[PDB]
């Protein structure tokens, strides 16, 4: 069972809609979770005009019902200091349902 | 893109979500940025224009060929036609108000309609020519 | 797509499944949305049109170049020809009735015929030009 | 052998045909199954204009003959609350034929 | 060694040639084999205009010389009731040559 | 495809497998559907046409640009040339008999020749224009 | 590329990061080479030109069709429009100073706008024609 | 170490050159080898206009110096009756050099 | 392809391997089918033509645009130029003898030259127009 | 736990900006780290006009906080003599956080 | 390619590595075949031409549209411009000496400039038209 | 640790530059190494107009400093008789640094 050791400031953006239909994100902070962060095989990835450096980072937190504040939705991102971990998906790692796998990137521009 | 393109997508978004038809046929699911949640599945999307730079010595303008796609999770896409028919009924000869300059004619162009992925979702693009004057 | 496209696919679906030939040659397997089950395997499909916006000052119309594909699991595709021949016998010069506006001429265009996948299935597209008047 | 713990409301849509040949789906509910849901490696996937977040979710239920109500056909979808699991295929996991693997997505828009 | 438990009605089509060079298939039945059917990882696959649901289904039967009726050629298909299993290839699974791997699809339209 | 396409592939298959040359150069390996077995390996294939809709007010016809490919497992493809030369000697100015309508001219068009896969097999397409009259 | 292209990208970079608008709308994030760090995410990029060699007997010049892309991490890309509008307000009819030769007209060309990847990032290219004289 | 049980008639084609530069193959027989034939995962493959059924078939024979008749060059093919096994490459399977892996197809038209 | 194509590749193979230059510059490595062995690595290859069907009422001919590629394992491909120069010196205005009909002019067309794979091997195609008369 | 044996001169380039927006790199040296260098499966890769020879080279160093000099950012490269190892990403290999996986190339022109 | 192409790449390589500029801006890193070693990283490359066969009844010539690419490992590619500017300053209106025939005009054509891979390396092609006379 | 048994004549080409910038290779022989040659999964590969037969052949030799004659650079090739092994990359297989993995092809035309 996972050994949780990092403090990840979970962050959810409020979506202020603009006139054209596109929302504007704020990334106001949410309450902090505890998690383990297990790396994957990382390599740099061609962005737009940026040679973005990415690593897979399966993050494991504890669980909650889907209408609770403690669930990381894939809308949200983690942030440890200045290292933003995006959330690709959340997937309910444990069999009994105690732990959630998340999926991250840590795309540093490099 | 050109200077009017900040105000053009804003005003064609406002003429949408005000038509009575496509409000009883799509709902509130007209957007550029997708509101995350359950993904309702019969939305439209209004983002990708391109400019054809029709300008002047004295002044300059733009030809925005903006694409409004219609995406639909229904089994057939006769549902997606009438939603796209309510797009085209709302926009050709619009004569709306912009924040930077004005447009002079919002015509109609090619409108392809196909299955995007696994043949589960159906995309109906609708290219509209927007000759705006800066 | 354009406003007539809600009624056009509906009426060309109704002229199909009423021809006596292609009812003894395909059966009830003419559709847009596939009825899930065993996948009979000698169907046709009528969904992907595109519009070429032929319009007016006073009024507007459309040129729907809709594609009716013929798919066939048979070893050769001489079976798929006569089913596609019964498509084209049913639709060129149709003069049918629409629910929004009317069409003025349902002509014929390019009709390619190839193997889609693993050379097991054979797709015969049939592009028909549908100049409708809104 | 699988330990079944989730309650999944199986749902089958009746196909009201429209005039153009396309059926209209309703997704009326069917009777509830019990299942285990085992996650796969998840990552977000480019939809149409949506950055859809998907995870593989091999779902295992019990079996039935193919002309029975209890078989999940790949026409159908599961739904646990508001989390719709589509069915990609059903594949008869067990050797003796007691259990069926299903294959899901959980495409949340994110 | 494989435990054979399913009854698969092997089917071979006679090829009535048409005038254009294309044969017309009949899929007249052949004698029934016994086999095991082991599933693979299944997912739905984009057909022509059909979202076909496929699963790999390595089927194992007993062997015969190549000029015998009991060999499934890849011309043929299996059929268990109304579930047609196409044959991709036959590959002689056993070392001593007692068993043949087949390779199937079960493409249900879904 | 068009109504004549059911009879056109049937008649150009019958003029093939009756020429004395290409019967001593290919054999019985002229087909659309492949006879399963050992795959002899110096066959031809006659399936993919497409139509260019040359029609009339009174009556209608078709321009079938059908492709007859020549596939050959030999090391060089000088063997595949004379088999394709015996195709073209058999079909240009054919004046054959159809079951639906008739053709008026079976001309010749582009005929590319390349290696399809791993450079082991050689495909010589031969596009023939078949102006048929329904 | 041509001899002026060493000085052209230098001068259009200097007219950028001096406009007051796009300095309060992008910031200091106008570059060719990306400063590594946290990747702010609402930048522009000015690198890919191409030349259309408009020259003379006596002397030679160039038509630099340089692309200035606008990339934006925001949910919608109405934010990316006004940043691209402030690009186009800064560059059409620029009349700037070069280090090798001079330019005679910095016009405007096509400016497409789409989602590059996973539909999270939005690229608005802006092609500007730069007829320079060496 | 491999247990050799099949008799494979090795075949080498003499290359009668034609006038255009292309050789004409004959596939005259060569002496017979003993081999094991281990199947791979097989599936049907899109040929030219043929839906060719292929299986990987790593064939293992004994070795020889490269200028000997007993080496299967990748020019050559095997043939067991009417089942022609092409040779993709030969690769010297054993560490001491006693055995050669070959690589086959068995492309039956199907 | 056309009837002359059986004899055309045969005769342009015979004018090759008879020129004194390209025999001291390539050797015996001029072929269509590759002789298996060690793959010498500075060969040429003469297989892919295509026909442009220039024909008549009375009689018929062909425009064979055959490609002769030059492949070279050397580090630079100045070695591959002079071998391709000795191709083009051997074939433009050839006036050779065919077995089926005759050719009237063996001209020269486009000849691209690039790196095929991993930038280790260099392919110089040489398209020659062969107007033959059947 | 990794056995660190190589001395890698870490190098960070100062970014002197030119007039056009592009920075000019210098690759001034930084202090030396100790690391292990574990190779991956290498093969030559098509560059621009160069047939570049690359190998994966997961390099493992010790860790530091992200605002410290001892962290290899993916901006930087390693250099052992004249063998420059680029850095693709850094990924925090250890569970407790003592060791960092790096990811290299060693693209020699060859 | 054509007969002059053996001498053309040789002479444009010799006019390069003799210009004083691009010798203090690239160095000795002008080549076709890459010298293996450490890969310096601000080289140019001169290999891929293609011919447009401009010839005569009496005599024959060629239009070599040869590509000289500029590759640069620097963060921005303002460094790659002045190296490419020193290419174009060295070659347009060259009037050099060939070993087979002569050239009559070495003009300038399109010169695109982009990021090849991972956006780390920048390729500036420079197409030059070389009308040579054999 | 690897058991070295083959004698591979290492070969390095001197690069006589031609007038156009392209060097001309000679492939003069260098001193002979001892190596093991471990095959990979081989299959024929589409060349230019040649159906080249390739196998991966990870070759393992002993090591040296990078400025020594005994290092196989990826410039060079091996040759055992008439079987030329190209070198894709060299990768320092051992942890202590005694052995080098090479990567080969053996592209026989076939």
Alpha-carbon gap, residue A70 to C36, rounded angstroms: 40
- What per-residue string of b and e applies to F101-111 under the rule 16 or more CB within 10 Å gives b? bbbeebbbebb
**J53 neighbors J73 (Cβ within 8 angstroms):** no
Alpha-carbon gap, residue A83 to F98, rounded angstroms: 74
Alpha-carbon gap, residue I21 to C84, rounded angstroms: 58
Of J82, J102, J98, the C-alpha closest to J40 is J102
Q: Residues, chain E, total?
A: 110
3-state SS assignment for residue G125: coil
3-state SS assignment for residue G62: strand
Question: Can you read off the two tokens belonging to residue J109?
Answer: 């022109």
Of I121, I109, I133, I100, the C-alpha closest to I11 is I100
**E4 neighbors E60 (Cβ within 8 angstroms):** yes
Question: Can you read off the two tokens belonging to residue L110?
Answer: 């076939």
Q: How many angstroms separate the most distant Cα atoms in chain K?
A: 52
Compute how many other C-beta atoms are within 10 angstroms of the C-beta atom of residue D69: 9
Q: Which residues contact L67 (CB under 8 A, 6 or more apart)?
A: none
Method underlying the structure:
cryo-EM
Strand segments, DSSP code E, in chain F are 30-31, 44-46, 50-51, 61-72, 102-106, 111-115, 122-124, 127-133
Handedness of CA D71, D73, D76, D78 (dihedral sign): positive
Task: Classify burial at G1, counting beta carbons within 10 Å of its beta carbon; exposed 0-12, middle 13-18, buried 19 or more.
Answer: buried
Alpha-carbon gap, residue E40 to E101, rounded angstroms: 13
Q: What is the 3-state secondary structure (H, E, C) of chain E?
A: CCCCCEEEEEEECCEEECCCCCEEECCEEEEEEEEEEECCCCEEEECCCCEEEECCCEEEEECCCCCCCCCCCCCCEEEECCEEEECCCCCCCCCCCCEEECCCCCCECC
**J26 neighbors J13 (Cβ within 8 angstroms):** yes
Strand segments, DSSP code E, in chain I are 30-31, 44-46, 50-51, 61-72, 102-106, 111-115, 122-124, 127-133
Is beta strand J58-62 parallel, antiparallel or unpaired with respect to J28-38? antiparallel
- Residue A108 within any structural domain of the chain: no
- Residue J1 within any structural domain of the chain: no
DSSP 8-state assignment for residue D77: E
Question: Can you read off the two tokens belonging to residue B45?
Answer: 């999307």
Question: Can you read off the two tokens belonging to residue E14?
Answer: 């006679």
Distance from chain centroid for Cα B111? 11
3-state SS assignment for residue J2: coil
HSE, side-chain direction, 13 A CA sphere, residue G127: 16
**G3 neighbors K88 (Cβ within 8 angstroms):** yes
Alpha-carbon gap, residue C2 to C16, rounded angstroms: 22
**D24 neighbors B79 (Cβ within 8 angstroms):** yes
Alpha-carbon gap, residue I32 to F115, rounded angstroms: 11
One DSSP character per residue, C77-134 reads: SSHHHHHHHHHHHHHTT-----SSSEEEEE----EEEEE-STTTSEEE--EEEEEEE-
- Residue H52 within any structural domain of the chain: yes
Alpha-carbon gap, residue J70 to J54, rounded angstroms: 26
Alpha-carbon gap, residue C49 to B77, rounded angstroms: 11
Q: Where do we find the tokens 């929302």?
A: A23
G24 touches chain D (CB under 8 A): no
Handedness of CA D75, D80, D82, D86 (dihedral sign): negative
User: Going from the N-terminus, what domains does chain F have, and what CATH number goes with each?
Assistant: 4-133 (3.30.2000.30)
3-state SS assignment for residue J28: strand
Is beta strand F30-31 parallel, antiparallel or unpaired with respect to F44-46? parallel
3-state SS assignment for residue I30: strand
The answer to whether the CB atoms of F119 and L49 lie below 8 A apart is yes
**G10 neighbors K78 (Cβ within 8 angstroms):** yes
3-state SS assignment for residue G57: coil
C49 touches chain B (CB under 8 A): yes
Phi, psi at K123, each rounded to 5°: -105, 125
Of F68, F29, F30, the C-alpha closest to F49 is F68
Q: How far is CA D81 from CA D9, D32, F11, F75, I113, in A?
A: 8, 12, 62, 64, 63
Q: Which residues contact C127 (CB under 8 A, 6 or more apart)?
A: C65, C66, C67, C108, C109, C110, C111
Compute how many other C-beta atoms are within 10 angstroms of the C-beta atom of residue H49: 21
Alpha-carbon gap, residue D86 to D106, rounded angstroms: 7
Handedness of CA H46, H47, H50, H55 (dihedral sign): negative
Q: Counting runs of H as helices and runs of E as strands, what totals does chain D give?
A: 0, 10
User: How far is D63 from chain A, CA to nearest CA, in Å?
Assistant: 21
D26 touches chain C (CB under 8 A): no
Point out which residues pair with K16 in neighbouring strands: none
For the CA atoms of C111, C112, C118, C121, what is the dihedral angle to 10 degrees?
20
Q: Which residues contact K103 (CB under 8 A, 6 or more apart)?
A: K4, K8, K94, K96, K130, K131, K132, K133
One DSSP character per residue, B35-94 reads: PPSS--S--EEE---EE-----SSS-EEEEEEEEEEEE-SSSSSHHHHHHHHHHHHHTT-
Of G3, F109, A14, L10, the C-alpha closest to K108 is G3
Alpha-carbon gap, residue L51 to L42, rounded angstroms: 13
Of G22, F117, C104, F89, the C-alpha closest to B6 is G22
Point out which residues pair with F115 in neighbouring strands: F122
Alpha-carbon gap, residue J36 to J101, rounded angstroms: 10
Q: Residues, chain L, total?
A: 110
- Residue A77 within any structural domain of the chain: yes
- Residue L24 within any structural domain of the chain: yes
Phi, psi at I107, each rounded to 5°: -90, -165
Of G41, G20, G22, G33, the C-alpha closest to G81 is G22
Distance from chain centroid for Cα L105? 8
Q: Which residues contact G60 (CB under 8 A, 6 or more apart)?
A: G2, G134, K92, K108
Alpha-carbon gap, residue B81 to C9, rounded angstroms: 9
The answer to whether the CB atoms of C33 and D23 lie below 8 A apart is yes
Handedness of CA G90, G93, G98, G103 (dihedral sign): positive
Q: How far is CA I54 from CA F49, F95, F111, H31, I62, in A?
A: 22, 20, 12, 52, 5
For the CA atoms of G33, G37, G40, G43, what is the dihedral angle to 10 degrees?
0
- Residue L50 within any structural domain of the chain: yes
Alpha-carbon gap, residue F121 to I100, rounded angstroms: 25
**G115 neighbors G121 (Cβ within 8 angstroms):** yes
Question: Can you read off the two tokens belonging to residue B117?
Answer: 């992925």
Chain K contact partners (≥3 CB pairs within 8 A): A, G, I, J, L
Question: Can you read off the two tokens belonging to residue D77?
Answer: 């979808």
- Residue L1 within any structural domain of the chain: no
Q: Where do we find the tokens 């383990």?
A: A36
Q: Where do we find the tokens 């026989």?
A: L108
Alpha-carbon gap, residue J51 to L89, rounded angstroms: 11
Alpha-carbon gap, residue L29 to G26, rounded angstroms: 61
Alpha-carbon gap, residue C61 to E52, rounded angstroms: 37
Point out which residues pair with G111 in neighbouring strands: B51
Q: Which residues contact B78 (CB under 8 A, 6 or more apart)?
A: C6, C9, C10, C32, D18, D19, D20, D21, D22
Question: What is the number of structural domains in chain E?
Answer: 1
- Residue D10, H or E segment: strand D6-12
Give A-chain residues touching K122 at CB under 8 angstroms.
Answer: none
One DSSP character per residue, L58-94 reads: EEEEE---TTSTTS--TT-EEEETTEEEE-------S
Q: How far is CA K34 from CA D97, F49, K13, in A?
A: 63, 49, 14
Question: Can you read off the two tokens belonging to residue G29?
Answer: 């994030």
Question: Can you read off the two tokens belonging to residue E30?
Answer: 């052949």
User: How far is E2 from chain D, CA to nearest CA, in Å?
Assistant: 11
Give H-chain residues touching C119 at CB under 8 angstroms.
Answer: 46-47, 49-51
Alpha-carbon gap, residue C103 to C86, rounded angstroms: 21
Q: Residues, chain H, total?
A: 110
Of C35, E73, B63, J73, the C-alpha closest to F35 is E73
CATH number at residue D55: 2.40.10.270
The answer to whether the CB atoms of J74 and A55 lie below 8 A apart is no
Alpha helices in C3-113 (DSSP H): 5-15, 79-91
List the 111-130 stretch of F: residues with Cβ below 8 A of L. Answer: 115, 117-120
The answer to whether the CB atoms of C78 and E107 lie below 8 A apart is no
Alpha-carbon gap, residue B85 to B64, rounded angstroms: 21
Point out which residues pair with B61 in neighbouring strands: B133
Alpha-carbon gap, residue K112 to G52, rounded angstroms: 9
C5-15 and C79-91 helices, crossing angle to 10°: 120
- Residue K87, H or E segment: helix K79-91
**F65 neighbors F130 (Cβ within 8 angstroms):** yes
Radius of gyration of chain J (CA): 15
Q: Which strands, in side-by-side order, build the sheet including A83-86?
A: A83-86, A77-80, A6-12, A28-38, A58-62, A99-101
**B47 neighbors G113 (Cβ within 8 angstroms):** yes
Of L9, L18, L15, the C-alpha closest to L82 is L9
Alpha-carbon gap, residue F10 to F101, rounded angstroms: 13
Task: Classify burial at A47, counting beta carbons within 10 Å of its beta carbon; exposed 0-12, middle 13-18, buried 19 or more.
Answer: buried
- Residue L83 within any structural domain of the chain: yes
Test mutation, D39, D60, D80, chain A, max A CBs within 10 A: D39
Is beta strand J6-12 parallel, antiparallel or unpaired with respect to J28-38? antiparallel
Alpha-carbon gap, residue E104 to E37, rounded angstroms: 9
HSE, side-chain direction, 13 A CA sphere, residue L99: 16
Q: Domain residues for L64?
A: 6-103
**Residues of chain L contacting H, Cβ within 8 Å:** 3, 5, 36-44, 53-55, 57, 81-83, 106, 108, 110
Question: Can you read off the two tokens belonging to residue B93?
Answer: 């000869």
Alpha-carbon gap, residue G98 to E37, rounded angstroms: 75
Chain A contact partners (≥3 CB pairs within 8 A): B, D, G, J, K
**C103 neighbors C126 (Cβ within 8 angstroms):** no
**J106 neighbors J57 (Cβ within 8 angstroms):** yes
Alpha-carbon gap, residue D35 to A95, rounded angstroms: 12
Q: Where do we find the tokens 């059909």?
A: E50
**B103 neighbors B8 (Cβ within 8 angstroms):** yes
The answer to whether the CB atoms of K79 and J18 lie below 8 A apart is yes
I30 touches chain H (CB under 8 A): yes
Degrees to nearest 5, angle at CA F62 with F61 and F65: 160
């Amino acid at each position: 069972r996972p050994r949780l050791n990092r403090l990840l400031v979970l962050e959810e953006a409020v979506r202020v809609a603009d006139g054209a239909g596109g929302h504007r994100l704020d990334w106001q902070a949410k309450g902090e979770v505890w998690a383990e962060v297990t790396a994957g095989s990382g390599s740099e990835r061609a962005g737009e005009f940026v040679t973005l450096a990415s690593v897979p980072f399966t993050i494991v937190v504890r669980a909650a019902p889907v209408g609770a504040a403690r669930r990381p939705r894939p809308e949200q991102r983690f942030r440890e200091g200045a290292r933003i971990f995006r959330i690709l998906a959340v997937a309910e790692r444990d069999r009994e349902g105690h732990y959630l796998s998340c999926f991250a990137r840590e795309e540093v521009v490099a | 893109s050109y200077a009017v393109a900040g105000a053009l997508q804003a005003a064609v978004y406002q003429q949408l979500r005000a038509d009575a038809v496509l409000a009883a046929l799509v709902g509130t699911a007209v957007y550029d940025a997708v509101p995350p949640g359950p993904l309702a599945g019969t939305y439209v999307s209004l983002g990708p224009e391109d400019v054809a730079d029709a300008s002047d010595k004295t002044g300059a303008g733009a030809v925005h060929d903006f694409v409004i796609s219609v995406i639909t999770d229904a089994a057939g896409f006769a549902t997606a036609k009438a939603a796209a028919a309510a797009v085209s009924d709302a926009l050709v000869g619009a004569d709306l108000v912009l924040s930077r300059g004005r447009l002079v004619g919002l015509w109609f162009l090619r409108a392809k309609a196909r299955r995007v992925e696994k043949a589960d979702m159906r995309r109906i693009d609708l290219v509209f020519r927007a000759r705006v004057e800066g």
